[PDB]
Amino acid sequence: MREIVHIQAGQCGNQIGAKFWEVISDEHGIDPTGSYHGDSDLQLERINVYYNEATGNKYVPRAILVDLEPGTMDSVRSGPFGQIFRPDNFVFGQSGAGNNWAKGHYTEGAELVDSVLDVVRKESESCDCLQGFQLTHSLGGGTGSGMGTLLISKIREEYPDRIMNTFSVMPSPKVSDTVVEPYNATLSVHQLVENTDETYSIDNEALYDICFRTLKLTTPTYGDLNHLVSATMSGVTTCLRFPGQLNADLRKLAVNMVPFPRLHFFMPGFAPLTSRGSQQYRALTVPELTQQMFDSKNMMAACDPRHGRYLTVAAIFRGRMSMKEVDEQMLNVQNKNSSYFVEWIPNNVKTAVCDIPPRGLKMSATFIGNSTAIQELFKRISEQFTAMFRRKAFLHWYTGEGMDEMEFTEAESNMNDLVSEYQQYQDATAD
Amino acid sequence: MRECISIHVGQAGVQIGNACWELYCLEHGIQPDGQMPDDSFNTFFSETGAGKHVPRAVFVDLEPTVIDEVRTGTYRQLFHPEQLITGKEDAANNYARGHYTIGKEIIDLVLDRIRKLADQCTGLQGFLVFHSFGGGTGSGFTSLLMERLSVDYGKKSKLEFSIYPAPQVSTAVVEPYNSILTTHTTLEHSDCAFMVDNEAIYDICRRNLDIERPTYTNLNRLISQIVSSITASLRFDGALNVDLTEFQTNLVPYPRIHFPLATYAPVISAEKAYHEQLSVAEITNACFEPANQMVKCDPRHGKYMACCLLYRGDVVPKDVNAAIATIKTKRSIQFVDWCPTGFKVGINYQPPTVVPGGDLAKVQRAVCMLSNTTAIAEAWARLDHKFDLMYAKRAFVHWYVGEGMEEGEFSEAREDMAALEKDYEEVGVDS
Amino acid sequence: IKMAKEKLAQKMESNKENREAHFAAMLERLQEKDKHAEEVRKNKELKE
Ligand SMILES: Nc1nc2c(ncn2[C@@H]2O[C@H](COP(=O)(O)OP(=O)(O)OP(=O)(O)O)[C@@H](O)[C@H]2O)c(=O)[nH]1
Ligand SMILES: Nc1nc2c(ncn2[C@@H]2O[C@H](COP(=O)(O)OP(=O)(O)O)[C@@H](O)[C@H]2O)c(=O)[nH]1
Ligand SMILES: [Mg+2]
């Protein structure tokens, strides 16, 4: 278990993915040329998990950039770290998906898929021991959503034994204007339930609410929302890219986090909450970081953790702090909040500490929770979907692509089953 | 002459192996390059044409990380490279991956290396197997290797040093599954097994050595001291010794009841200087204190079937007998009705050696008590209950099934554990 | 020991029986959830 192959699909996928690479490059002391200029051996210890070493001192992201639309790719290349990416790894179409899952999954996406698999195969065959894949995408769009899930299915066909991980951004009325987002999301959730091993449910509803309510940003931009996404992605991947005991690889993480196959949707949390540039000169002690695990205000999925129960929790503390203090504080939270943890999964809260804090913060905490409260996010999508589907609104955009009504009915039913499954284990007892 | 082959499996086994072999070298005056300026040490170290002393040991891991540290470390010259065996992909805390999927690829290579060591033996006594119960390699690979060793070695003695899992230092939610699966499969292949509860060791380091947050380095140094006490009788020729067979003859009354409880004393912090020197009476009294035990359990709630006291250093038989006589006046030490002769005593001349810069103080005399008590069943019960909690809901079972294991294997393993618990209950009943 | 060797070479073959057959299903799903694609690309050029 060593290399992770990263895939970025669609507008959102490429935007968040590009920010992930500038964030982690900075943490690993890699400049936009690929040269390591840091001053800590920890930065290079597990550099091979995300970077290939090119001739000499240079490091290149093992990242494949995909879109059916060329524009986003040009914006990435033009960017701060745009020059770091492997030229041959940009695979872009000309024809666009027009925020239509059917175009991304069946039409335009299907035409480009083979050119993408050719690049993923090149990266995969170079690997000493491929752990699996990591995909960043939105569920509300057409390329990220439709093509992204098509890629998952095609990759799964060729690499059925590798771990499939995603960072899936869920749509919200608060931040986007394609009216068809509930259809694209539901059709994608149906695919993820079946095809991924772990999915980080990144909710734009929660990110907008954090920016507006907490960060007091009157009109949030995607740049503001993406600063929270990149902070979360850096946190949840800490264990994979730095030397550590717990959840050191994708398989160990999945084995410790996923009790039932379908219940692989994680609710990420982050403390402290920061705005682009907002120092972080004096803030956050160990008891303070620990308390924000149950804080709905700190959740990257618009769910209240106190409205459900945690099946499994992984908590990653970053910065210079006491391991004794972390252990005490973590135990206190489980004892005080007994009722929000399932009794039939013993020692279900696992903690890890990494000496390297993320950029701009001296202390941080990342939470990965497998909570039954995630059903609130799926319920929201189902009710938005049904409000439209009841009236068969915008169905012409999908049927016009060759899709059938049954697929819509099936995707919805599968997602409602997922909600029902979370409710079942929420109500289950250690009798 | 009377050789013993040591096999170190998985992270726990390899890391404990590092501690053991470091201690043996200090005890026999062997430098980290194998050079040395009794003669019984030859049971554990072979000799080359260059006068170098090489451990009769094999280090195995399915991931290279841990062993890579041995081959870069201080004792890189002590071992020949062929006896340090590593795979690429770990067992990802999955018994099924360790036993089947991944294990099956390296098994033949590991046995070929063991065969090469056995060919250098004129009177091979058998094997000492060090592993964790919790990790996928420690659990899965060990049971696979134990089965293969019974086939290739006929009726050759096999003793285990098993790391019983603890939540303070636990890395996986699935450790109860791995523990039960390995115990069931290995039971018919092991002659005697010494369990080491990581919580007991964690608590001794905290209580006796004043270590706020004990690390594996702290735990292993203490473990190594107990292993050295058990193996001193094989590596040295004292006034009172016990070979592979005499240990088993004295402590094992029935095939399945082969789990002695170890208790060590004294454990003194390298500070103070006034907290010594402890008499033979004082160290003997300390063996009957549950705080000095290697497994957490209550002997006062169980019955003894055998008691072996292994003394080391400045100890006289008259001192020992006086100490045992006062202990016999404390009525509280109950033996089974079918056992008369309770105390078998051994004295080995060499005082306990400590690692320079270690946490342990140098003492003139120490003692290790190996007792076969029915109270050890409490450790099985704790493990079995955690297994049952998860298994009732089939939580995480899919990870094992996916690797080709069948659900029936889980039922079988648990029923065998129920029979083992029943055996300890039946053994304690009077006629 | 005679009977022992076989118990193990059975274990590793009823496992390898399964491990193979759970990637039998893995692919048959993966081929059907592709057969549908043509059956749907169908309705697109068929759209009249
Ligand atoms: N005493 C002690 N216990 C250890 C050590 N390393 C791991 N453990 C314990 O063993 C269990 C974890 O299993 P590991 O040995 O780390 O894993 P592994 O055998 O390498 O297997 P995989 O990594 O899954 O392939 C937990 O209970 C740990 O607390 C060590 O050096 N000393
Ligand atoms: N957080 C975040 N969401 C985005 C971003 N760009 C688009 N989205 C969201 O993604 C969805 C639209 O999908 P998009 O990725 O633009 O389309 P695609 O190129 O066809 O996958 C909606 O839910 C948008 O709110 C971005 O940069 N950040
Ligand atoms: Mg390991």
From TrEMBL, chain A:
**UniProt xrefs under CDD domains:** beta_tubulin
Residues binding GTP, per UniProt: Q11, C12, A97, G98, N99, S138, G142, T143, G144, E181, N204, Y222, N226
The residues listed in the UniProt record as binding Mg(2+), with positions renumbered to this chain, are D67, E69
One GO molecular function term of this record is: GTP binding
Which positions are annotated as binding GDP?
Answer: 11-12, 99, 138, 141-144, 175-177, 181, 204, 222, 226
Residue intervals of the Tubulin/FtsZ 2-layer sandwich domain: 246-383
- Cited SUPFAM superfamilies: Tubulin C-terminal domain-like, Tubulin nucleotide-binding domain-like
- InterPro entries registered for this protein in UniProt: Beta-tubulin_BS (IPR013838), Beta_tubulin (IPR002453), Tub_FtsZ_C (IPR008280), Tubulin (IPR000217), Tubulin/FtsZ-like_C (IPR037103), Tubulin/FtsZ_2-layer-sand-dom (IPR018316), Tubulin/FtsZ_GTPase_sf (IPR036525), Tubulin_C (IPR023123)
Q: Where in the cell is it found?
A: Cytoplasm, Cytoskeleton
Q: Which UniProt keywords apply?
A: Cytoplasm, Cytoskeleton, GTP-binding, Isopeptide bond, Magnesium, Metal-binding, Microtubule, Nucleotide-binding
- Cofactor(s) required for function per UniProt: Mg(2+)
A cellular-component GO term for this protein: microtubule
Which segments does the entry list as coiled coil? Answer: none
GO terms, biological process: microtubule-based process
What transmembrane ranges does the database entry give? none
Role, per record: Tubulin is the major constituent of microtubules, a cylinder consisting of laterally associated linear protofilaments composed of alpha- and beta-tubulin heterodimers. Microtubules grow by the addition of GTP-tubulin dimers to the microtubule end, where a stabilizing cap forms. Below the cap, tubulin dimers are in GDP-bound state, owing to GTPase activity of alpha-tubulin.
Q: Give the PANTHER family listed for this entry.
A: TUBULIN (PTHR11588)
Q: How does it assemble?
A: Dimer of alpha and beta chains. A typical microtubule is a hollow water-filled tube with an outer diameter of 25 nm and an inner diameter of 15 nM. Alpha-beta heterodimers associate head-to-tail to form protofilaments running lengthwise along the microtubule wall with the beta-tubulin subunit facing the microtubule plus end conferring a structural polarity. Microtubules usually have 13 protofilaments but different protofilament numbers can be found in some organisms and specialized cells.
Similarity-based family = Belongs to the tubulin family.
Name by which UniProt lists this protein: Tubulin beta chain
TrEMBL record, chain B:
Does the keyword GTP-binding belong to this entry? yes
* Residues that span the membrane, as ranges: none
Which positions in this protein are listed as binding Mg(2+) 1? D61, E63
- Record-annotated residues binding Mg(2+) 2? E63
Q: Where in the cell is it found?
A: Cytoplasm, Cytoskeleton
Q: Which GO terms describe its cellular component?
A: axonemal microtubule; condensed chromosome; cytoplasmic ribonucleoprotein granule; cytosol; neuromuscular junction; plasma membrane; recycling endosome; sperm flagellum
What residues does GTP bind to?
A: 11-12, 15, 91, 93, 132, 135-138, 169-170, 175, 198, 216, 220
Catalytic reaction(s) noted? GTP + H2O = GDP + phosphate + H(+)
Keywords, alphabetical: Calcium, Cytoplasm, Cytoskeleton, GTP-binding, Hydrolase, Metal-binding, Microtubule, Nucleotide-binding
Where does this chain mainly localize?
cytoplasm
Top-level division of the source organism's lineage = Eukaryota
**What biological-process terms (Gene Ontology) are attached?**
adult locomotory behavior; cellular response to calcium ion; centrosome cycle; cerebellar cortex morphogenesis; cerebral cortex development; dentate gyrus development; flagellated sperm motility; forebrain morphogenesis
One Pfam family it belongs to: Tubulin_C
One Gene Ontology molecular-function label: protein heterodimerization activity
Q: Where is the Tubulin/FtsZ 2-layer sandwich domain?
A: 240-385
- The residues that hold Mg(2+) 4 are D90, T137
Q: Which cofactors?
A: Mg(2+)
The record's section on InterPro entries has: Alpha_tubulin, Tub_FtsZ_C, Tubulin, Tubulin/FtsZ-like_C, Tubulin/FtsZ_2-layer-sand-dom, Tubulin/FtsZ_GTPase_sf, Tubulin_C, Tubulin_CS
- Residues annotated as binding Ca(2+): D39, E47
Occurrences of domain Tubulin/FtsZ GTPase (ranges): 41-238
Q: What does this protein do?
A: Tubulin is the major constituent of microtubules, a cylinder consisting of laterally associated linear protofilaments composed of alpha- and beta-tubulin heterodimers. Microtubules grow by the addition of GTP-tubulin dimers to the microtubule end, where a stabilizing cap forms. Below the cap, tubulin dimers are in GDP-bound state, owing to GTPase activity of alpha-tubulin.
Q: How does it assemble?
A: Dimer of alpha and beta chains. A typical microtubule is a hollow water-filled tube with an outer diameter of 25 nm and an inner diameter of 15 nM. Alpha-beta heterodimers associate head-to-tail to form protofilaments running lengthwise along the microtubule wall with the beta-tubulin subunit facing the microtubule plus end conferring a structural polarity. Microtubules usually have 13 protofilaments but different protofilament numbers can be found in some organisms and specialized cells.
Q: Which family is it part of?
A: Belongs to the tubulin family.
Q: What is this protein called?
A: Tubulin alpha chain
Q: Which organism is it from?
A: Ovis aries
